[PDB]
Design an enzyme around this catalytic site. Structure first.
Site, short mmCIF file in Angstrom:
data_model
loop_
_atom_site.label_atom_id
_atom_site.label_comp_id
_atom_site.label_asym_id
_atom_site.label_seq_id
_atom_site.Cartn_x
_atom_site.Cartn_y
_atom_site.Cartn_z
N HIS A 287 22.26 26.70 29.54
CA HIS A 287 21.22 27.28 30.38
C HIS A 287 20.33 26.21 31.09
O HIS A 287 19.99 25.22 30.51
CB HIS A 287 20.37 28.23 29.56
CG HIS A 287 19.34 28.92 30.35
ND1 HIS A 287 19.65 29.76 31.41
CD2 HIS A 287 17.99 28.87 30.28
CE1 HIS A 287 18.52 30.21 31.94
NE2 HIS A 287 17.50 29.69 31.27
N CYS B 59 44.10 18.75 51.93
CA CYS B 59 43.03 18.59 50.90
C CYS B 59 41.93 17.59 51.15
O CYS B 59 40.77 17.97 51.11
CB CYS B 59 43.64 18.20 49.54
SG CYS B 59 45.40 18.54 49.32
N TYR C 44 44.56 31.21 52.78
CA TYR C 44 43.47 30.39 52.31
C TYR C 44 43.05 29.28 53.26
O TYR C 44 41.88 28.96 53.33
CB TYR C 44 43.70 29.89 50.89
CG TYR C 44 44.46 28.60 50.82
CD1 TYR C 44 43.79 27.42 50.65
CD2 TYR C 44 45.83 28.56 50.94
CE1 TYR C 44 44.45 26.22 50.62
CE2 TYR C 44 46.51 27.36 50.90
CZ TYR C 44 45.80 26.19 50.74
OH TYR C 44 46.40 24.96 50.66
N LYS D 60 40.06 18.17 54.61
CA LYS D 60 39.55 19.50 54.56
C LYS D 60 38.31 19.48 53.68
O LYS D 60 37.19 19.95 54.10
CB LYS D 60 40.61 20.45 54.06
CG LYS D 60 40.24 21.87 54.05
CD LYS D 60 39.43 22.12 52.83
CE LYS D 60 40.20 21.72 51.55
NZ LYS D 60 41.23 22.73 51.20
N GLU E 246 39.05 28.90 54.83
CA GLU E 246 38.39 27.66 54.55
C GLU E 246 38.08 27.04 55.87
O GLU E 246 37.02 26.43 56.07
CB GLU E 246 39.38 26.72 53.88
CG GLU E 246 39.53 26.85 52.41
CD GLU E 246 40.55 25.84 51.89
OE1 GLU E 246 40.79 25.77 50.66
OE2 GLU E 246 41.08 25.07 52.73
N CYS F 277 48.49 16.25 51.89
CA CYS F 277 47.21 16.27 51.18
C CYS F 277 46.20 15.22 51.63
O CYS F 277 44.98 15.48 51.72
CB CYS F 277 47.38 16.03 49.67
SG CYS F 277 46.01 16.72 48.68
N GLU G 3 27.34 30.02 32.74
CA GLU G 3 27.00 30.76 31.56
C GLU G 3 27.15 32.30 31.72
O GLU G 3 27.36 33.03 30.75
CB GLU G 3 25.57 30.43 31.20
CG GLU G 3 24.56 30.90 32.24
CD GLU G 3 23.14 30.70 31.79
OE1 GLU G 3 22.31 30.20 32.55
OE2 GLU G 3 22.86 31.03 30.61
#
Ligand code: FAD
Ligand code: FAD
Lengths: 439, 439
Positions: free
Chosen positions: A428, A44, A159, A47, A163, A39, A433
């Site tokens: 908002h 992670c 994935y 990356k 990425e 990681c 939302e």
């Protein structure tokens, strides 16, 4: 004598090690490369830094629609030193935290043959299949050494590949990704991916389907060719990256003479992370729970921390591998929890699955001086199973989707329903939302 | 004859109007200025566009730590035309949706003296107090006409003022905000605001406390002076903006001869939005519920849509004014739901309030080549009331805090606890996951 010796200073061992540390255990952890493992040094962290980088490039390429006059160049070697500069500081910090809590760190490779409870935390290492030309290939890891490149080809569509290819394009590099099936990301909801691929193709990322590379040629140095089994050939790659998957660092731990079980190198364990042999435990993707694997940093953090507890205070708390929120840091990013619309129907049947979805444009793109239908999109999906509509899956792809999901996961774990969301007054204006007005 | 005539085509009237439209009501709506009212033409929409703008300026000012060579200028008049260009398109869209659903729009000022149920939806209008020099002042609205400016002073410290001053600085303009108390944003958690003010001051926004402006002088045109009651004087302002608050557009509706009640111009109503006089209803911040006011677009959207229901299908559904998630689009932004740590203690008592908080640096700032402690921060707070720790308040300030809260609100409405959050496996790496490890 130690109460517990940690083998692996990656995500899992460290957390494990410090937690037990917290409960007064005499703890020991031994590491062979830099601390923070996969990681931190090759997953992670970098990356994610490169994803931010590619985000700055798009903001710079488009600032003109916001009033700015911009002229910029990009220099990858700089992003490289900044980013490694960062990584170097974390290792020191980790080694600092390791003295802060009284754990006796040891640098070296670990091997079985003084501790009371020994924890295996040695995650994976990359996988290169028996393919012709594979010698001419590199791995996701190595990518972090790349400081020069005009064309890159990635083989895989998991994935990490997506990425990475999206990060690659957004750095000025011409880009291909080869995939075996009909579409990349075969494990995620197909609509969310239709939007992903449309946008990638919009940004000139080349996606090749039904590809089986049977040969990796090297015309010369940094002039490679990818051969597929159906006649398509693809030339001029300086780097071909194989993103096949990863396999446990288990090969020589001098383990066999212990009858500790092994499926395909993964160390088997139970709800409690116990081996066949007690005293000896295992977390981190280097193991398999049952059997789930699940290679994510926060999961191995959970596991290790929780174990320490059964080991030092009380057992009560166990790791739940069911419901794992994910973020594909693609461009755009994808937030995904629970079942896809099709996984749902494989489980509860089509008569029981209702879906809610939306498609819109983030307000961020309002000033972009281009035809609406050509603006980067945002798409969301609610998959509902039952009668008052439990949400069994939740997905969205877009600007900031990486930051909108964490929270909804607290709500999926609480079996929330369409109606919980509906009674939730929205904020908002925000991308998030939209989840509350899918009427 | 109409089943319902909508007065006010802002947030509330429109939603109301189209919803009842959906239930087959003969609907009519009359508007005097452009459609979409306050939120669209002079609130949320442009404000949010200018917040994005200021976000691009910071990204451009800092791209160098990400490998880029950047030289840029900003031209506010352009941001101005792009942004009004946008706004012009929404009005047309709203008028399109209004024919799509069969509502008979009418442009003109509305006044009482053919409809069966008449809905007041005329929100506010700005407030200028009896202050000396006030003639030399403008309002938050007018700010949207500003295309040139070297120094601006805002009087007030409510959410609009802070959002606006932060947007103002980040556009190259020298900035002051005058506040009556000890700190801006007196209604929000004090720690979250300590971080806000520290950062503002870090970015050279000048914040003046205990200020009572008793005079607004005009030396000349665009050379103004702000006089406070204690001796401090503040010169050279091209614009002084008063962000006092807003008051209902109720003055001449030819209402009195109807005995419809009035507190201080706000139209009183009940859980159902009914007046003293039936047949006649009211949503939008132009009203007061009991008594809550609450001036937010999504609330007036809820109200209007829900009413239509009692009016056309069934009553069951009523608007909940309790638990209102908010986002202060400050720099950095602030996500806030529920009680502050002190509001909590005014209600349940200090013996019952436990708090969880965090302070860290977004990974985005990792490459910034500056001393850690000088990087823009992120701070979060969990306020817990009780025994298994209900979360009665949730707040955070930082990069993307605007996008991280929506979701947690679904969970606060479900009375989630520290432990719901704790069993929630986190997404890595993200700002939002910090919420799940506050141990
Ligand atoms: C490119 C990439 C991107 C990723 N992105 C994400 C992401 O965004 N989000 C996410 O959640 N996860 C991500 N992951 C998955 C993540 O890296 C893993 O889930 C995580 O690293 C698990 O680490 P671990 O503790 O299980 O083992 P590791 O972190 O790999 O550490 C094990 C440690 O043991 C040491 N060791 C090995 N053998 C011996 C001996 N013999 C003695 N010591 C030994 C190793 O050096 C290592 O330090 C990513 C992985 C990759 C490769
Ligand atoms: C600067 C600013 C920023 C804001 N930012 C946010 C935000 O970020 N988030 C948020 O949720 N809220 C925000 N708001 C609050 C938001 O604007 C209000 O909550 C919202 O506009 C409420 O509108 P309404 O439907 O109640 O009335 P309005 O939108 O004001 O519309 C009422 C309509 O009736 C018309 N009318 C008036 N008198 C007559 C007659 N006589 C006949 N027709 C008549 C008016 O022209 C208007 O079109 C902001 C407000 C401002 C001023």
């Amino acid at each position: 004598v130690y109460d517990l010796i940690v083998i692996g200073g990656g995500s899992g061992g460290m957390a494990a090690a410090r937690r037990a540390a917290r409960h007064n255990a005499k703890v020991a952890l031994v590491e062979k490369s830099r601390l923070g493992g996969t990681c931190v040094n090759v997953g992670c962290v970098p990356k994610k830094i490169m994803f931010n980088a590619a985000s700055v490039h798009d903001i710079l390429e488009n600032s003109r629609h916001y009033g700015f006059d911009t002229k910029f160049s990009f220099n990858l070697p700089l992003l490289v030193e900044r980013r490694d500069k960062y990584i170097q500081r974390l290792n020191n910090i980790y080694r600092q935290n390791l003295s802060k809590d009284k754990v006796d760190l040891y640098e070296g490779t670990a091997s079985f043959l003084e501790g009371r409870n020994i924890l295996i935390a040695v995650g994976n290492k990359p996988v290169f299949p028996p393919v012709k030309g594979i010698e001419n290939t590199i791995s996701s890891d190595e990518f972090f050494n790349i400081k020069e490149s005009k064309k890159i080809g990635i083989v895989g569509s998991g994935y990490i590949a997506v990425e990475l290819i999206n990060v690659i394009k957004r750095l000025g590099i011409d880009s291909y990704i080869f995939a075996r099936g009909n579409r990349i990301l075969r494990k995620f909801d197909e609509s969310v991916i239709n939007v992903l691929e449309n946008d990638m193709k919009k940004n000139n990322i080349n996606i090749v389907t039904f590809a089986d590379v049977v040969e990796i040629k090297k015309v010369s140095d940094k002039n490679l060719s990818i051969h597929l089994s159906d006649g398509r050939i693809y030339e001029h790659f300086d780097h071909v990256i194989y993103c096949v998957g990863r396999s446990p660092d288990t090969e020589n731990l001098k383990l066999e003479k212990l009858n500790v079980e092994t499926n395909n190198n993964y160390i088997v364990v139970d709800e409690n992370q116990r081996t066949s042999v007690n005293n000896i435990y295992a977390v981190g993707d280097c193991c398999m729970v049952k059997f789930y694997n699940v290679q994510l940093t926060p999961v191995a953090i959970n596991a290790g921390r929780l174990l320490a507890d059964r080991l030092f205070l009380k057992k009560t708390r166990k790791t739940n591998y069911k419901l794992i929120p994910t973020v594909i840091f693609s461009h755009p990013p994808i937030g995904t929890i629970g079942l896809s619309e099709e996984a749902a129907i494989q489980i509860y049947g089509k008569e029981n699955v209702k879906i809610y979805e939306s498609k819109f444009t983030n307000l961020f793109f309002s000033v972009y001086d281009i035809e609406p239908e050509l603006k980067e999109k945002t798409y969301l999906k609610l998959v509902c199973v039952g009668k008052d509509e439990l949400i069994k899956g939740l997905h969205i792809i877009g600007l900031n989707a990486d930051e909108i999901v964490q929270g909804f996961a607290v709500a999926l774990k609480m079996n929330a329903t369409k109606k919980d969301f509906d009674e939730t007054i929205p904020i908002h204006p925000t991308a998030a939302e939209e989840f509350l007005t899918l009427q």
